[PDB]
Write a protein that binds this ligand. Structure first.
Ligand code: NA
Lengths: 280, 195
């Protein structure tokens, strides 16, 4: 049982003079989630030790109470980058729209993980206010931010990000390109079809994997033939993805491209043409 | 078991009370953790390799050498088999690790390793009912350059999830070797965890 005997016990250990007992009590508060711990952890958001601030920030997002937003909103400006991350993580876990503008500021942080998690947090909130700032994070020097901004821009699904993500399919890092491809797949814009088709000729076996799945999500038929040559991909999963992504873009355009592969197809391209022409 | 190794080092408390404080739950002496805190700070380990026991390691070490990372090894490895324990020190020679963690609670023949100029530690612990969050070592390592985890092949679906969960909760990347569909980037698709 979630008995309050342990709850209020760790709660009183937040004012303990031992750092270890403090944040270890904050972690138990997050794993318990009993809402009688919101105010004690809000006071712990300014503990002299950063980990107690980190643990209390994380625990506030674990309880999921609206009263932690504005405290965590101020905890975004914490001196310690881990507390800034934990508050930005917790704000994304609470997902209150009050945190959008602070997380937009955390998109301009210095820890490339706070900006990374502020992006991910703004993706969970899904507030269209965060679209334009996330587009600026598609130019952040850290790839994990560019990639997390791309993932967040696709989770928001706002069309404003399409062309910024289209130009993010030409980024030097393959992970942000993996995200920009996955993002444009979730947004499902017809504009991204031609750039994702060119992304099917990417050196990264993951960008080809996402761009294949993306074009399957978009369901556009301009990528039917670019997915046929993707069925001859050296990466196994890009081939299987294009097999999945072609069953999505159904119709005769894929059917007529299957009967030419049930006749003149070889390898894995023949393998799914017969199986599709079986299960139309 | 549970045991970490350390290279020969060279030149190496400061303004860091909460980090050594988090080591105290598992580390024994107050200067024990204090020396193993400076372990993470100097080299600034940027990658944690997770495995079990052998060709799996050269894949992840290649994958650790795949992002310009000064990695740190971690794996199960339980019983003896020649080398292994002896080759723990050669991981630093072969793969250039900055530290290797090996998961024998008793016996703990650590002097078998630290005899040949290789610093080591001791135990830590496994499953615990929310008494002390062991996972926050990733956060202390994150401040010391840990930008990504790298999961070698052979990890169970729990260790895969635990490392991917640790990738979520600490803003860490994880690289695989579920590991073939969208779950290969679940920590990025879902940056914030769930129920
Ligand atoms: Na561990």
């Amino acid at each position: 049982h979630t008995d309050p005997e342990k709850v209020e016990m760790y709660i009183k250990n937040l004012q303990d003079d031992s750092t270890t007992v403090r944040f270890n009590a904050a972690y138990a508060l997050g794993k318990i989630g009993d809402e009688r711990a919101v105010e004690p952890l809000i006071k712990a958001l300014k503990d002299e030790d950063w980990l107690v601030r980190f643990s209390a920030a994380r625990a506030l997002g674990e309880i999921g109470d609206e009263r932690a937003v504005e405290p965590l909103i101020k905890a975004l400006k914490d001196e310690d980058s881990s507390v800034r991350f934990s508050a930005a993580y917790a704000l994304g876990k609470i997902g209150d729209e009050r945190a959008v503008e602070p997380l937009i500021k955390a998109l301009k942080d210095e820890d490339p993980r706070v900006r990374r998690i502020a992006a991910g947090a703004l993706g969970e909130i899904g507030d269209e206010r965060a679209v334009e700032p996330l587009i600026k994070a598609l130019k952040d020097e850290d790839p994990y931010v560019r990639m997390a901004a791309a993932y967040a821009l696709g989770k928001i699904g706002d069309e404003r990000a399409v062309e910024p993500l289209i130009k993010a399919l030409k980024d030097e890092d393959g992970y942000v390109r993996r995200a920009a491809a996955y993002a444009l797949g979730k947004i499902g814009d017809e504009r991204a079809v031609e750039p994702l088709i060119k992304a099917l000729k990417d050196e990264d076996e993951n960008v080809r994997l996402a761009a294949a799945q993306a074009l399957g999500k978009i369901g556009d038929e301009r990528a039917v033939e670019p997915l046929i040559k993707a069925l001859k991909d050296e990466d196994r999963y890009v081939r299987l993805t294009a097999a999945r992504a072609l069953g999505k873009i159904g119709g005769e355009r894929v059917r007529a491209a299957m009967e030419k592969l049930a006749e003149t197809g070889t390898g894995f391209a023949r393998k799914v043409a017969v199986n599709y022409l079986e299960t139309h | 078991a549970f045991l970490i190794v350390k290279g020969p080092s060279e030149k190496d408390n400061e303004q860091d009370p909460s980090a050594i404080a988090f080591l105290k739950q598992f580390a024994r002496n107050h200067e024990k953790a204090e020396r193993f805190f400076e372990l993470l700070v100097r080299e600034g380990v940027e990658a944690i390799i997770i495995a079990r026991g052998e060709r799996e390691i050269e894949q992840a070490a290649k994958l650790a050498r795949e992002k310009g990372f000064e990695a740190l090894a971690f794996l199960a490895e339980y019983e003896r088999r020649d080398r292994q324990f002896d080759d723990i020190i050669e991981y630093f020679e072969r793969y250039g690790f900055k530290a290797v963690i090996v998961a024998k609670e008793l016996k703990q023949a650590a002097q078998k390793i630290e005899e040949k100029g290789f610093k080591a530690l001791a135990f830590s612990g496994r499953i615990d009912q929310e008494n002390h969050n062991i996972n926050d070592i990733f956060e202390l390592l994150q401040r010391q350059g840990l930008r990504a985890i790298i999961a070698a092949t052979g990890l169970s679906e729990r260790e895969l999830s635990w490392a991917q969960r640790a990738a979520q909760q600490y803003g860490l990347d994880i690289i695989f070797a579920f590991d073939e569909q969208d779950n290969r980037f679940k920590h990025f698709l879902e940056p914030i965890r769930r129920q």
